[PDB]
């Protein structure tokens, strides 16, 4: 029942808006009258140079939030939406004990048991699927170059 959902700030998928009065979300609409279904998440301002420590519950919404709403409509469970500590995916970087490369980030918080499910459009590659199981890819998306 308790599903600690972790997420990173994705610019089209995870919109993080501060609460209006006290822990509340504004019932904003889309371009066709459909109201925006936000959720209560726990997020900081920035990383450690940005803010020293200021993590508040705000309103997270976008795409994957309504996707998890569709999941909870589908299957009988509850959840717990929170954010990721850093602003990284989490790679196999070295730990200071005689150059031993381990994982961090979203993978480092998932394998620590602090997280439960990473609802994020991560690039499925070899070695991350070598260690944990993934889901089937909902999004079919490539890579390209942005210019001016």
């Amino acid at each position: 029942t308790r599903l600690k959902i972790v997420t990173i700030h994705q610019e089209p998928f995870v919109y993080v808006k501060p609460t209006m009065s006290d822990g509340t979300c504004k019932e904003e609409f889309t371009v066709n009258g459909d109201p925006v279904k936000k959720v209560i998440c726990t997020g900081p301002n920035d990383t450690s140079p940005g803010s020293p420590r200021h993590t508040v519950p705000q309103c997270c919404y976008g795409f994957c939030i309504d996707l998890l709403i569709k999941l909870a409509r589908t299957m009988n469970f509850t959840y717990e939406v929170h954010l990721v500590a850093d602003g990284k995916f989490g790679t196999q970087e070295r730990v200071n004990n005689s150059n031993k490369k381990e994982w961090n980030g979203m993978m480092g918080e998932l394998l620590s048991g602090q997280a439960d499910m990473i609802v994020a459009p991560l690039t499925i590659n070899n070695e991350r699927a070598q260690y944990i199981e993934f889901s089937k890819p909902f999004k079919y998306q490539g890579l390209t170059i942005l210019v001016k």
Partner: protein, 315 residues
């Protein structure tokens, strides 16, 4: 039946050949990872994209047009002032002005107003330069290569009933396929319209598209893309890239409990993540296939001008 009848009934181990991915095949056996982005699409006959717009005023002169009429009325009022300073230019300056814009053999008068002649000369040089710029902008509108589509959705207004549209269209698939099961999982009425327009095979429908005995054909995306890259004359080109579709993929269905499955999935990840799959796509695809009169709308505006002249004619 088929590969499903061979693998689920354990007469075959796996199907290393390509296979569509849908609900019940994922229910009976477990696929591999989707190694290629292969949804579904519809091959059409031809978009018939001709570079001619129906309108020529509002897509071209919208913000220029207001300032052009403002400067036209200013120059005409100045000509009225010069004609009243020192033999028909009381209110008829506008027809003279916009006839000397084009110079289509319009005999008006011999101007003795020197200020009128100077303003006509400046406005005539201005008329020459915006006529040159408008011809240049018509060339610039020709420069891009566009194509006008007709069916821009799976919920298209043609798909309700072809009695509303004066050409009746046509579309069909092959029997005993997963495409029909996907359509029946979408619309029973679409199967009702498709059952009367059934056909035999893929290349038979291709020949029907070549000869013009078929309009639309629902199939997978990348196979139709490969057939369109080898199309003769570059006519049979699909609309979009599966944007209005379920956007499935291709996988390798193994028996549920096969120990080879993880090694196959990691080998597919290794084949994708080094350009070797990109080398195979270069070896087995093609992408060289890149991207006259639509008049009488301004004739409808001409008929509206005739109606307004008949309105002003009676009084």
């Amino acid at each position: 039946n088929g590969m499903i009848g061979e693998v689920v009934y354990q007469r075959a181990v796996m199907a290393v050949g390509s296979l569509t991915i849908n609900e019940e095949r994922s229910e009976v056996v477990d696929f591999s990872v989707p190694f290629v982005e292969t949804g579904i699409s519809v091959m059409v006959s031809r978009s018939n994209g001709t570079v001619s717009p129906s309108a020529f005023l509002e897509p071209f002169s919208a913000s220029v047009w207001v300032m052009m009429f403002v400067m036209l009325l200013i120059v005409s009022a100045i000509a009225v002032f010069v004609f009243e300073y020192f033999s028909f230019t009381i209110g008829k300056a506008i027809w003279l002005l916009w006839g000397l814009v084009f110079n289509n053999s319009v005999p008006v008068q011999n101007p003795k107003g020197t200020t009128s002649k100077i303003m006509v000369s400046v406005w005539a040089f201005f008329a020459v330069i915006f006529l040159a710029s408008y011809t240049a902008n018509l060339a610039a509108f020709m420069i891009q290569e566009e194509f006008v589509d007709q069916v821009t959705g799976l919920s298209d207004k043609k798909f309700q009933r072809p009695h509303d549209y004066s050409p009746p269209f046509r579309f069909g698939t092959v029997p005993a396929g997963s495409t029909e099961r996907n359509i029946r999982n979408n619309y029973p009425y679409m199967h009702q319209y498709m059952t009367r327009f059934n056909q035999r095979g893929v290349e038979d429908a291709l020949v029907s598209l070549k000869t013009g005995k078929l309009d639309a054909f629902i199939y997978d995306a990348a196979v139709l893309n490969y057939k369109a890259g080898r199309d003769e004359g570059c006519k049979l080109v699909t609309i979009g890239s599966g944007y209005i579709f379920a956007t499935t993929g291709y996988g390798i269905a193994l028996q549920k409990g096969s120990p080879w499955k993880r090694q196959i999935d990691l080998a597919l990840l290794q084949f994708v993540g080094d350009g070797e799959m990109e080398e195979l796509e270069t070896l087995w695809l093609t992408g060289i296939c890149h991207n006259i009169d639509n008049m009488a709308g301004v004739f409808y505006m001409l008929a509206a001008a005739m109606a307004l002249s008949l309105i002003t004619f009676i009084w």
